[PDB]
Amino acid sequence: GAMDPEFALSNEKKAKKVRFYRNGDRYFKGIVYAVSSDRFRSFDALLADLTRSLSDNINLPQGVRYIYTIDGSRKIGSMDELEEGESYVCSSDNFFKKVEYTKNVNPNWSVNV
């Protein structure tokens, strides 16, 4: 029958797929996370989940306090700056390390739809 399906009968496209990397890892290809208005009310909420998901008590003391651009030129403050299939770096108290965050890496992560 069909009373009330959760997620298996027609669904609109929303949110944004990003590959999150933790500043200073190199070997770590990062973790993919989805972001929208229904999941995260703001960057602060994302950072909350990011801290827990990317937590490593190594290069990320408090998990994740801020999110920087793949280059680290500027840190994002609003979700409106996060675009689909985007690559971000997690920062807290570091000067951002310019590594092969996506050099020679398979960018087929943003294609699981």
From Swiss-Prot:
Q: What's the impact of mutating residue 22 to L?
A: In LISX1 and SBHX
Localization per Swiss-Prot or TrEMBL: Cytoplasm; Cell projection, Neuron projection
Its post-translational modification remark reads:
Phosphorylation by MARK1, MARK2 and PKA regulates its ability to bind microtubules. Ubiquitinated by MDM2, leading to its degradation by the proteasome. Ubiquitinated by MDM2 and subsequent degradation leads to reduce the dendritic spine density of olfactory bulb granule cells.
Task: List residues, modification Phosphoserine.
Answer: 10, 37, 53, 73, 78
Entry comment describing in which tissues the protein is expressed: Highly expressed in neuronal cells of fetal brain (in the majority of cells of the cortical plate, intermediate zone and ventricular zone), but not expressed in other fetal tissues. In the adult, highly expressed in the brain frontal lobe, but very low expression in other regions of brain, and not detected in heart, placenta, lung, liver, skeletal muscles, kidney and pancreas.
* Outcome of mutating residue 25 to N: In LISX1 and SBHX
UniProt superkingdom: Eukaryota
Domain Doublecortin positions = 16-102
Modified residue Phosphotyrosine is at which positions?
33
Reported disease: Lissencephaly, X-linked 1: A classic lissencephaly characterized by intellectual disability and seizures that are more severe in male patients. Affected boys show an abnormally thick cortex with absent or severely reduced gyri. Clinical manifestations include feeding problems, abnormal muscular tone, seizures and severe to profound psychomotor retardation. Female patients display a less severe phenotype referred to as 'doublecortex'. Subcortical band heterotopia X-linked: SBHX is a mild brain malformation of the lissencephaly spectrum. It is characterized by bilateral and symmetric plates or bands of gray matter found in the central white matter between the cortex and cerebral ventricles, cerebral convolutions usually appearing normal.
Describe its assembly: Interacts with tubulin. Interacts with USP9X.
Q: Per its database record, what is this protein's job?
A: Microtubule-associated protein required for initial steps of neuronal dispersion and cortex lamination during cerebral cortex development. May act by competing with the putative neuronal protein kinase DCLK1 in binding to a target protein. May in that way participate in a signaling pathway that is crucial for neuronal interaction before and during migration, possibly as part of a calcium ion-dependent signal transduction pathway. May be part with PAFAH1B1/LIS-1 of overlapping, but distinct, signaling pathways that promote neuronal migration.
This protein's name: Neuronal migration protein doublecortin
Organism in which the protein naturally occurs:
Homo sapiens
The stretch of the full-length protein covered here is 45 to 150 of 365
